[PDB]
Amino acid sequence: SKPQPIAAANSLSELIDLFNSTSINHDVQCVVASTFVHLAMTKERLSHPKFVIAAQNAGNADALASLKDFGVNWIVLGHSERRWYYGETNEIVADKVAAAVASGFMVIACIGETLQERESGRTAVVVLTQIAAIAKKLKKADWAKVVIAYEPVWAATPQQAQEAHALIRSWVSSKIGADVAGELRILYGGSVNGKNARTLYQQRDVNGFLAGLKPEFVDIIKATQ
């Protein structure tokens, strides 16, 4: 069977009212990741116990310490623009991930290739090098706290997403262990809506979504069964 799925989202007050009133029938960890300045409000307002608040991109020991102290236990790291715009390298993201885990966080670590990388058939070498860097700073036991989001930056069909996710899980199995591989949530972080979410989740190696904080996130949740 699949590990517990994750639905994570990366005007606002209307969105949280909506999430709060939503009945979610099945086992699924929901995550609302927000920017620093909206954190307190989101935390005051979001009360659905199947949801947790995540920080984003924090990389400083003291910052992580305060978030944790503030009751934030999740963080999202390495999201696409962090790498292609802000210049966070494979190693910078790796160190952020290791720092967060050491501070008691559950980490959604993002990886993904650009259009130029996908077009040239270098998806595998790129994606695996990104996670290899992440793995280098983590111990096997740390993987209990880790979640991988695959982001088709280059954008996708369920078959394409399945192939990407499957290639990630094979590298994990062989380099980290089959037991880690089996428990690891690998989320699909490409474009998704209420039409293809359900289709995508059906894929053997998709364990959820890293999608947009948007009214239709609710359908993304339902897509995880």
Curated annotation (Swiss-Prot):
GO cellular component: cytoplasm; cytosol; glycosome
Protein's name in the database: Triosephosphate isomerase, glycosomal
Keyword tags: Gluconeogenesis, Glycolysis, Glycosome, Isomerase, Peroxisome
Further comment: The enzyme contains a high proportion of positively-charged residues in beta-barrels V and VII (compared to the homologous regions in other triose isomerase sequences). Since 2 clusters of positive charges located at precise distances on the molecular surface are common to 4 glycosomal enzymes, it has been speculated that this might represent a signal for entry into glycosomes.
Subunit structure: Homodimer.
One GO term of the biological process aspect: gluconeogenesis
InterPro entries xref list: Aldolase_TIM, TIM_sf, TrioseP_Isoase_bac/euk, Triosephosphate_isomerase, Triosephosphate_isomerase_AS
PROSITE patterns, sorted: TIM_1, TIM_2
GO molecular function: triose-phosphate isomerase activity
EC number: 5.3.1.1
Cellular localisation: Glycosome
Keyword match Metal-binding: no
Membership in a protein family: Belongs to the triosephosphate isomerase family.
